[PDB]
Amino acid sequence: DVFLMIRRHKTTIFTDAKESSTVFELKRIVEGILKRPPDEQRLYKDDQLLDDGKTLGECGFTSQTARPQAPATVGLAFRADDTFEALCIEPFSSPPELPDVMKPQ
Amino acid sequence: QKRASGQ
């Protein structure tokens, strides 16, 4: 059982998939969320097309590195009209950088 | 005892 963060531009789908389930079910689970067919979308594990045939365990989504505490992100594009777009995954925010008390100042 | 309790 593997937990993911399917981010496209600013959305962040918090889904849970079986370790043995393939990428096609991961694309089809978005049908009930953003209502767009799996044909017109492709996933992205850090600039890596995730094809329908290969399973989630093959493409590095092991349950050790995508635990619920820190799920592993995966990109997405919705093809626009006919040509897919680049990963515009925006970073969340910069938390207030607490100063290091051991830093000499 | 011979006497009562203390007070």
């Binding site: 959305t11 505490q69 969340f92 925010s93 207030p96 | -």
Partner: protein, 96 residues
């Protein structure tokens, strides 16, 4: 069965509705005038909760729901020191 926890920046953390009702405040926000099923997912606005902490909140939702009544020893939720204070106020506000 999905709800769209919009943060202050604009990030739309779409988490399952069963996970979101872990927090009392989100369950209250999804009751009354807030339960009106606009689109399919109920857009919950969090104008005071940033994205870098709402992501941790949603991760905690999917962590507690998965790890509830766990037979094995449960691992602690990883809260970074820089996020800990902002996630403390977000945990109180959300009553989770």
């Amino acid at each position: 069965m999905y709800v769209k926890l919009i943060s202050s920046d604009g990030h739309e953390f779409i988490v399952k509705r069963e996970h979101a009702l872990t927090s009392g405040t989100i369950k209250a926000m999804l009751s009354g005038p807030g339960q009106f099923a606009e689109n399919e997912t109920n857009e919950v606005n969090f104008r005071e909760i940033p994205s870098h902490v709402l992501s941790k909140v949603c991760m905690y939702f999917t962590y507690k729901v998965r790890y509830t009544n766990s037979s094995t020893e449960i691992p602690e939720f990883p809260i970074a020191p820089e996020i800990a204070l902002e996630l403390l106020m977000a945990a109180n506000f959300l009553d989770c």
